[model samples]
Target chain A: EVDKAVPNGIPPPQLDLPYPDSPETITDNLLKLTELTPNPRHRFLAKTLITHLHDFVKETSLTTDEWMTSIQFLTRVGQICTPVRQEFILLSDTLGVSALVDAINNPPVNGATESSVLGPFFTDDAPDVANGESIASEGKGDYMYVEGQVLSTDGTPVPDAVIETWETDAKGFYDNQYKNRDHPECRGRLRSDKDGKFAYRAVVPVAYPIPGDGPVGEMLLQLNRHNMRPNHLHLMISAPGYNTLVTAFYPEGDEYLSSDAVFGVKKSLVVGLEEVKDDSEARKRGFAEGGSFKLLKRDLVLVPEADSRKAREAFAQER
Target chain B: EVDKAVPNGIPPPQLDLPYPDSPETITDNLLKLTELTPNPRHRFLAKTLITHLHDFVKETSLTTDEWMTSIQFLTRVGQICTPVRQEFILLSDTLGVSALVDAINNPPVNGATESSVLGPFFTDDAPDVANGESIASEGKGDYMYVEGQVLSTDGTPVPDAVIETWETDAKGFYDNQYKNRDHPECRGRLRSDKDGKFAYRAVVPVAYPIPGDGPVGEMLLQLNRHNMRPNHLHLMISAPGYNTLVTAFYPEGDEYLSSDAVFGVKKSLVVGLEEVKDDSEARKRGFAEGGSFKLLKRDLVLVPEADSRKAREAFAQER
Candidate 1:
């Protein structure tokens, strides 16, 4: 029996007693537990995590009340998560861990667009749309024609590259963020034409605050920080041989561009939006023939997986 | 008006982008978020915690899947907690953090009994019982007579000291650990008589496993560890001018004493239980005149608060 394995009798004289209060002992004991982790990687990570956590608690001489409060805060964050919203990811983004992971995994190439956070609103099932079609099914905001070309790092156009895009409505809310939306709006997947060009009509993106009614929002408020992201459109571009790109392009003049809540804006991914006042120019771009429109042209450059692998190998060797 | 704070326009050229992917950069960026923590202690702990957590992730090169698993594990831990059970504390105990914290807060003195973890089974509302009364109202196991005297480091009796005691039943389960129990069993509070002596009858404690149906248990299994604690009785002795003592005395011959799951056993807190075969001896000790009994004699030594305060001050000064 399992109980027989640990029976009633005189205990061994060599029992390990609790260690002293020093940080070294605490960290060592925690690391000892990780030694039994079967997976090497899991053991490494668990050891590191335990060491850091114990050190942090000791360094701060954390009070009991503070520790309890943090525990409750984490529980609240988990309780608030649902199928549509991942508060843990939001916490990671707000804490900048998401961007840090992205940077580590997708190192910058000379001519390729730099990657940013895959924000909380991204969904993989964006409906496929033909090139030059409007993603906005129910137009409610100022009309804009977005045109972009997918290119190799060396400047050659790459045809048939898929551009998966998503954005909040003009009212600064994603389709899922609302309670009354009938269908997903202002988001779609479009493949670049033979010329490596893609165009879609969408409502001009608007600056918006992240969901602030949850624990993440409450934390930000307590820290005297705002929960705003710049006006931007999420874009994920992928082709057969090139590395996939997960990024967002912010409008050059958006107010929150310098202070995106998720630290998602990159200087290289910011582009200017030009107002097209001529009726012919607006009509030529496939908007309603008579009215002026906003035009955003963002050309994306992707590096081949082979080139990125070589670069990563070289970087590793250098280190 | 909130949007007015971060307006649409050309972003500043000196905007802060995501920091580079390095230990220093990660730590720095995470610590930056704690700058606005209003409470000084909160700010200190938050900064330390963020720094260590980021460093841990980076050092281990933690994969996305592992990180997600940890997040989910924490969420489950929180979800399983209720007013009666605290899984987070259990997590801490199993990890040895709970014992470490207790050591830090209640440093050991030369003659004082060493303190250990106040396990999750402790309840402040333990039913009050008179001295020499049986804590086990519905007794069903081998009977034992427990007698102890609370004394100061100088060996003088500590009058009116409160002795709070609790333990699992002979079946190795606390009252709260069962769904069929009518009331708390094998746990009670009693005051030391004027002579600083306390005594009560209780069933002999048996080695028991912790709650093994939870994530903590799963983690222990994965770590190739057991969750059994040695047979012991929990005690917390407190008086006005003496430091409160939280500890448990294990039977010398318990099989799991060397492998307590929570790392709570100490050499100083282990004592032998003597068998009493003489009916006259048992009757004199308040047991049934004809029945044999087990006798455990434990004398608790507590340190004065003034001495502890002075030691703490000197330690702080040295630091």
Candidate 2:
């Protein structure tokens, strides 16, 4: 009989194992695969990645052609990214995945500077700016003064901290966005005085769209999501023996703030920007020839340096 | 003083969390995602796709841009495919993923016609031919005769089993490969005689390259892999209550057999094509004049139909 082809006494293929290709079976196979890897990290990463990937594939019912296309797409994405423009990073940011990573790595600490999504525009060396110097060069919008102190969670001043700040111009463009510009303008470094005090003058940041000329932008439009972000300034505050804080503060009352294009605005990070009529006060604070604006003061408390991923990255990059 | 940021009784952040993005965490989040349809087959299929997809992403560390690029590529691939040419399916076959899926879905049973990858060139309603009638038309290389019997696993004659066959022309091209060509040349459908015997005459098949102008060819070149598949003839044999077999028989001693570009060759499916010097013998097999150089004979055995995924799909498509 044809049943004789069965090697042992195993019942010639029964209906009990209806789905040999089911996730439960595959998960068992994958778990066994991890045991074959010698490196714990590799094994863990592979297992985790596989499990999640398997679930994603099942969720989407992906076809063989779609899978191959995915591989090709990844190759192109990697090939297109350079030191200046990280489309891959921006892709992660707009998908809310970067924020998820940020949350996982840096949980909220009471009284500490809130961490936010790292946008794609940061550069290593921002030019030095004095306490009252304006970082904005392109004459565009409302003049606003930003002042802040680096303090401990107990509200004690932590002096001599350096605040690296960058933002797009009033017309919603960073200096680096221009190809022919030799230097990246409106992006600068400033150090706080002995009292942990620092301030800079620039146009009140304006709402702007993320780079929309790429594949990511096309996908957002397809998914019915806009690419506009609320007016915000990027900040990276670093202090000796204290954790570096990388985040952004969105101006409150902006129409897009609640739904910031990349979903980056957090409740705690929104600082109201009330208009001020005192043009002389604004001029004294180095605001350029524009409408007067209110001051935004945010006292940042940081965790210890030893526990900070950003601080480690900063040191590693500098070294 | 920064210790106060940890809050009244919260545990300090743990440095080791297996990964910055934990598996359990993501899996837990994924569980919160809506469950799909409750059908076991659909769930099984969905789980397999999702898991494979998720793993593919993590394995490649795919970025958002990469994902979007993949979506775009897939859209284009679908757009380029037509009834005469299914570039996407061809791409899948060349990658071996199509065969992999078939293998996963169709577990082998004893005496069953062993299955192979289904190429994208199949068309319905091939012209019917009487037993032993030559299916090869002009330009179909030197002749060969294939003979087989349809029988139950118990060796009883299955009088009405049908055999469907097709192959590329001598120049390594299908009729559809040439646009605007006459339809259904070198392809035929035939039913077994009363004694369950079947036979036909055709050209000796040759190794051929898959079309090289599209993204599939581009990927093959990038991966440094060849596109040549071994010499083979396609067959679909079927009988009521018996398993429908979609398979190919490779000519033995072909160098590309072991590394067939489409990965369609099976060890048990190789047969020898004898060089026949007697013209009269070829004429008896219904070959044209001067087509006596090549002749081949291959026998097939099919298993009964079972409740496998392959059976389900074949039945669904046929229905």
Candidate 3:
């Protein structure tokens, strides 16, 4: 229950607002109240947010039942969250809000790898793997050899860069999505060598549906939209004096590539998986099965920290 | 864990969308996907909502930190909810979204009483009270007599109407706010008399801050605004053939009347309480203290159910 003992320190608004009896008046009153927000940034955001929220309600003529349903649904999504799970973030991703915000804030820099939604499956416990090592245990999925050189936008190799990579199993389930995850699987943390090169033997990631046990899952159903992200490998890399990159590589042929549930795909990030059928080549790449493997040869470009900061600041100023 | 076994029945849209590398492209992609919605009403709502949401982001040029802050804040609000508490509803109320929806859905009918927010303190267990009895227990607050007639919009007395009334006590706390030792206090359910008349002895409700113990309270603080509602009493009346009315009466002299946190006050619903100092008048109203009393004499008018439905349908169609 609310504490009514002492009022919130602030007093009522001095502005004379008309009673919120009409739809228009309610919006008007809310906008007037929003003017009281103290900080410039907060005031600006609140003004725009309040305007859009009111307009949506007026434009839809949202019914009481619809309003209550949305409220309860959002409550359930929050209640469903745990330390390892975030249903609210899934809701934003499925609705494309996450992608839109990323694009706006991380406006693309020349030669820099495009950013993507950091899906909920990323974990801190990925075991460290050095160059030319296996990130996934045996019997996980079809073997895939990932080799890449991390370089600056100027094509200068970045030595000793920290890289964290993760992906779903062939069944599209992250290791944590199980009854008892004894240890992390299909994911790893690694560092680049002095040559600015990194390589890993891993299972081919598979496209997976976003968690469907929560209210966000129900929202996708209501929208008549799919809840799938194309099979992809998540790579988050960082180095001194460079902007950290959070991105993924979407194999070009997956049917769900174009209509990613979270809108994470960009044309530049689409990649081809070259089939290598030689057993010797598989063995050379440390694949236990040693029969055949998929080769993913990619290069990542990082933006200098100063340049990235300037670009972001300019965008914010322009707005 | 989410069920990733099977995808949602919907497949990707056939339309070719440009990669969402830019903010504009991301919004365009979302709009394109919104066309896949099956229901016409749902499609329209989705389209409008997506447009407004994108516009807000663009207008504010929301930063990544701000975006994550909002996501986490919303999640916190949702998680704070329980069977007996609704932080989400409080968020909506504080944002004025709930009030806007209520105003749009329940358009006012001529001669019909205006609607108001049903605050969280409402409960179903109020004891049945007969006319001339007390809704509040003895020594709850200052004495007040509430006498009202339920009538149709056309002025015909509507007998046998069920009227549910509740309010906070002098301390601005509801009966449920305290610990055990309680039958329902300051609330009751009663039937209108044959002449459409009903009267009950009760306490004078005080202006109170909305639950200030959650994210919503913090939101008001961010806005530099107070969280108080005017001293008021809630009334919900229903009878056969008439639309149920949910409303509140704000005694006109309260400081927070014009700035009610939940926007529940309406000019038409503002009232004046007549004070009578005679001990005899207090005793007649069943006030055990036998001192002075405040009187509220008001009549409620309800719209015909058919009329209300027609008004609502017309609004929906107009939208």
Candidate 4:
């Protein structure tokens, strides 16, 4: 019979915790309270998370002003998001949590593609393209031909593999980042042919700064860190019996490759772009301008769904 | 030159960090980057905070779904805040960080008052009231009298101490919660008399649920905890050369007293209301109802600026 706000169907903790007489008491009481979380994982995550959150406050002796600043910053980050804009993901990416999570969940095995941070731009609305078709329309950027084979760890073809790929325009902006966007651009979905061979013509991606207009950007400035991510192409491939691989390919020699803002780059995912100088070859690859184009050829290797699950679950034993 | 977003002027870290090929690599890279922070405290806080953040992710093997859930929840918490509402502070209170920060910053000495979590309901717009006058308008709630003297921890009366106080109405709502057209009610500011004495007529604050209508509310539900806070009066007392004391007094015997929703209560803060049956005293105190009033008598001990600063600084050594 207090205020009308419902009590969440939970009873008050039975034991009388000392009124928060001291810093330790507050933390201790909360840990005990989290035990009531019925979902075991939620309970565990809550307990572990709160333990560190309190410890951080204690360890830093966080001042009231600092706490308020953080609260305000977090609010700004949340409010910055829209249906397409993901400010929280941007925060995670800058903090390296997104990369860490990706690395932890997808342990790289020999011959299998490595996963990278899924930057904020990947979308499910990319148009479908047939093999050897163009994902980008003419005039978007310099012509580039991307050809790759989907293979298993055993070097066998992964036929019928569905690949979703996207990237920024040569001007270094995703189609979604534009206000005048009429349709998805510079991105596409394709399936492997009978031989696991796939090809698509798209514009080259360029290294660009993640947005510097939100809370995540403000954090980078406070930390005095650059916000540039290296140029890369995102590829998400999945098939009936293979683990879905969310990854990106970094072309060699990019200045920001090593210090990518989101920590998305991995050595094995790095590729070299071959220059095709013959005008006939460029035209043959669907470059309407008939100019020289960049040729990127690579192979994506996937682990069997069953094997990746076991490795993913191995995180348990290691912990 | 790649895009329009301005870089933060920080050079990418001088050393070439390997791509985030592993989780450890991502964490190590972030710590190294944090060294770029020009301010030592900023550097230290970023390093410590990010360390714990990454560690929490790894320890939990936080799933993609779990992380997205967190980001969305965090965004929700931030966006829910308005000019009058602070959803982030509510989150800190529920997670116990607010209480911990308060306890650490305001370490209790033998005579000085203990600090409590400053809940989100406080506002700076309270109307100033003369000592021995009424703060609540008639019919806002039951009759109650709050009187106290402000003293230094050294045991001397601290004359002319400024006291700011606020509390809920009998309906368990702060004055700010109302959307009506007008003036502030149920809260006031006052200064002690020459003898350090202070008195005011106010309504008894009742136990109430802190909005279960936001992300914090949803979190409590998931954590399986009640949202009810015990009835208590909030008081902030300060004077020249004294460390401001932020505290509250909880009347004993409330059902949720032991498990206050915000963890604001302390054993020393628990007080009892004495029933006064004299109609004359009630009328003399300006209660128009001509009925009995609950009398709350207490004294606040303020810590000297010099003394409290030394104690607050000691947190550095302990850490």
Q: Write the per-residue lDDT of candidate 4 for residues A171-217, one digit (tens) a residue.
A: 88888777777788899999999999999998888888888977888
What is the lDDT for A275 in model 3? 95
TM-score of every candidate: 0.86, 0.55, 0.94, 0.93
What C-alpha lDDT values do all the predictions have?
0.73, 0.62, 0.85, 0.84
Q: True-contact fraction for model 1?
A: 0.18
Residue pairs with colliding backbones in model 4 are none
Q: Looking at model 3, what is the TM-score of chain A?
A: 0.93
lDDT (10s digit) by residue, model 3, range B15-117:
8877665668777888898888888888988899889877887777777899889988988998899887888988898888888777766666877888889
Candidate 2 lDDT over B47-119, as tens digits, reads 4543454444434444334445554554455445544455666665654445554544444544555678767
Q: Could you say which candidate leads in DockQ?
A: 3
lDDT per residue (tens digit) for residues A1-319 in model 2: 0000111111111112221222244334334434444555445554655456544443444444556555454444544554445566666565455554454344444447767766767888688999988777746466777887888766778887888888877777776666556776777898888998888877678777776666666544443445677789899888878766888888876766544545466667888876787868766665565447767878777777555555434433432
- What 10-residue stretch in candidate 3 chain B is worst by lDDT? B1-10
Candidate 3 has an lDDT of: 0.85
Candidate 3 stretches greater than 4 Å from native: A1-6, A178-183, A277-292, B1-6, B277-291
Q: Per-residue lDDT of A193-231 in model 1, one digit per residue for the tens? A: 888999898878888877777888887776656778878
Enumerate the chain B TM-scores of all models: 0.86, 0.80, 0.95, 0.92
DockQ values for all predictions? 0.29, 0.06, 0.60, 0.57
**Each prediction's RMSD to truth:** 4.9, 12.5, 2.4, 2.9
Name the best candidate (by lDDT).
3
